Amino acid sequence: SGFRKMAFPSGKVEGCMVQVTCGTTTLNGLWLDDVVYCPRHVINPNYEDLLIRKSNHNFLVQAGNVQLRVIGHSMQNCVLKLKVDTANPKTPKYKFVRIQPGQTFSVLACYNGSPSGVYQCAMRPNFTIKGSFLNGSCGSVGFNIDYDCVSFCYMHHMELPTGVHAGTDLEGNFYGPFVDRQTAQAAGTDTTITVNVLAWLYAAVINGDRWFLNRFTTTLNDFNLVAMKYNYEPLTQDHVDILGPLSAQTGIAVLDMCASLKELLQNGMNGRTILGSALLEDEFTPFDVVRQCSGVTF
Amino acid sequence: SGFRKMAFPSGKVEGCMVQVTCGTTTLNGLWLDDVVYCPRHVICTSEDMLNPNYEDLLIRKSNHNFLVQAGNVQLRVIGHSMQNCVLKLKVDTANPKTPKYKFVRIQPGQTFSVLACYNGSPSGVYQCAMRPNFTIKGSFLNGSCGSVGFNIDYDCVSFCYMHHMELPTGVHAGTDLEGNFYGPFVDRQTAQAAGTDTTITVNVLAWLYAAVINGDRWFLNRFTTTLNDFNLVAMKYNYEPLTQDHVDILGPLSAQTGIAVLDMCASLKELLQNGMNGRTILGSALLEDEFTPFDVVRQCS
Ligand SMILES: CNC(=O)CN1Cc2ccc(Cl)cc2[C@H](C(=O)Nc2cncc3ccccc23)C1
Ligand SMILES: CNC(=O)CN1Cc2ccc(Cl)cc2[C@H](C(=O)Nc2cncc3ccccc23)C1
Ligand SMILES: [Cl-]
């Protein structure tokens, strides 16, 4: 019993965190094999013009108390790739993956190449992450661990004026219509990840919380007409299919659980809580619920 | 900016997790130097749990009855001793991944990270607090026994909790790393229940100061209170009494934000009376109590 916002064990990622310094700027890098990946803003910025003026020795890379020597440098989209002399012996089995909004991941927040904390979070429908970052956190990474393979999905780049965060995948492509520079940019209006709220309602049922269940059902179209009114993401047939295992385990059909959500949106919680929360939680996917309520290890 | 329930990086602890098997029972162990620490109930059967005589069950065991697995390698047990509710298995290999560490006993209200493990394999990490009733509201399934709670301050891992059991309300009970339980609990399947739980007042205040640091002042008011009047009110909401030590501990946050502790107490008194009125504080519709004054300074500064 119990339900917590749980992150993947960060150990395999901690062994990859390095400090990258270029001039006055200091941020984090991800050292995998003989390459260090970091945000290109470490160097209206023309990044080809600023980079062509740099030599290998202008980049100081520190792995613990050891300085790594940069032997080459190249740019791929908004990530700087620093070729180093030493291959990281702690390099885990890994992939670079690009996630979709609604998908969750773990963030190992670092300052000066040192990991300070780990938290779980979701890619919002507006492509931002509601993270906890201070200056110096740039280059911190987001990941999922699947079996023994670390799938790197996020690299932190900047903070938006509303306090939310923006970053790229490990190939340097931003999530969202953001650019790496000081200019007027704002996060779009956010929506609730409906499939995740439903997964969390199924997690509550598994943990013994059933007060919100009702005898009713709904059509997918009627549910979406109500979801659109409450700034909830449209629920698709794929979402319904993905919730199948949870539906079969608890005996509550997805459209039956949708009618409970319809009632919660129109009427509120009435002084009650679900899994110790007075708000409808949307940062646990259907897979996170199955993994936590079944105990999968890495 | 931003405020998250943040756990310590688990790497230094992952390198210590081993699987301990005794007969039919399999649970987790903490391998530090040449010793593996695990719950002593690993020597028990399910029947033994009502009234187990651990000294009697342990005297019948030999070193080779305990199977310890570190990754894909079996460790050889060369000795065994019991210290309170923990079994200490002396092994023939010192863990090369042993970090710099201490065994610390925490007080209620203190927070720590939990690396939840099954079969000696870490599956997840989360943050939690020692509740005033000495339980932890964790997320554990069968096989998680032996999972540990810790804090990492500088390069030193302070082990403060080892998981032993789930109480009937779904909450969890365990011991410090010297085998002394937190609370009036015993490693017996007896009728035991958690005492009435209360809110950790000093932590809610620390979290209100975190919200002020992040730009949220909507809940502040023009009032102050005496410590005694605050406690008379807070007790009616099942909030832990706030002591002068708590007030002293909140001093740095008070000085940083410019809001006196008793002024912030007046805001809390008003929030308990009115509720939030459709509003949130740091993305929460409830008053958060699992961030200490130390956690707030660490995450915001
Ligand atoms: C709010 N940001 C600033 O005033 C300065 N910033 C301007 C800027 C512009 C473009 C790009 Cl790509 C990066 C940055 C830098 C930036 O966003 N880094 C930060 C990252 N995460 C949390 C941060 C909390 C606080 C400060 C800075 C953070 C630095
Ligand atoms: C609810 N517990 C049971 O039915 C069986 N239990 C009885 C018992 C009694 C005393 C002691 Cl010290 C340990 C245990 C064992 C126990 O509590 N382990 C578990 C730990 N954490 C989460 C657990 C979720 C589910 C099951 C078991 C968990 C095993
Ligand atoms: Cl303490």
UniProtKB/Swiss-Prot annotation, chain B:
It comes from the Viruses. It catalyses: TSAVLQ-|-SGFRK-NH2 and SGVTFQ-|-GKFKK the two peptides corresponding to the two self-cleavage sites of the SARS 3C-like proteinase are the two most reactive peptide substrates. The enzyme exhibits a strong preference for substrates containing Gln at P1 position and Leu at P2 position. Inhibited by pyridone-containing alpha-ketoamides compounds 13a and 13b. In turn, alpha-ketoamide 13b (tert-butyl (1-((S)-1-(((S)-4-(benzylamino)-3,4-dioxo-1-((S)-2-oxopyrrolidin-3-yl)butan-2-yl)amino)-3-cyclopropyl-1-oxopropan-2-yl)-2-oxo-1,2-dihydropyridin-3-yl)carbamate) inhibits SARS-CoV-2 replication in human lung cells. Inhibited ex vivo by michael acceptor inhibitor N3. Inhibited ex vivo by compound 11a and 11b. This is 3C-like proteinase nsp5. Changing Q189A: Does not affect ability to cleave and inactivate human TRMT1. Residues 1-301 are cytoplasmic. It is found in: Host cytoplasm; Host Golgi apparatus; Host nucleus. There is a cross-link at K5, K90 (Glycyl lysine isopeptide (Lys-Gly) (interchain with G-Cter in ubiquitin)). 3CL-PRO exists as monomer and homodimer. Only the homodimer shows catalytic activity. Interacts with host FBXO22; this interaction promotes the proteasomal degradation of nsp5. Residues 1-301 form the Peptidase C30 domain. Cleaves the C-terminus of replicase polyprotein at 11 sites. Recognizes substrates containing the core sequence [ILMVF]-Q-|-[SGACN]. Cleaves and inactivates human TRMT1, preventing tRNA guanine(26)-dimethylation of tRNAs. May cleave human NLRP1 in lung epithelial cells, thereby activating the NLRP1 inflammasome pathway. May cleave human GSDMD, triggering alternative GSDME-mediated epithelial cell death upon activation of the NLRP1 inflammasome, which may enhance the release interleukins 1B, 6, 16 and 18. Also able to bind an ADP-ribose-1''-phosphate (ADRP). Changing K90R: In strain: Beta/B.1.351. Changing M49A: Does not affect ability to cleave and inactivate human TRMT1. The active site is at H41, C145. The chain holds residues 3264 to 3564 of 7096 of the full protein.
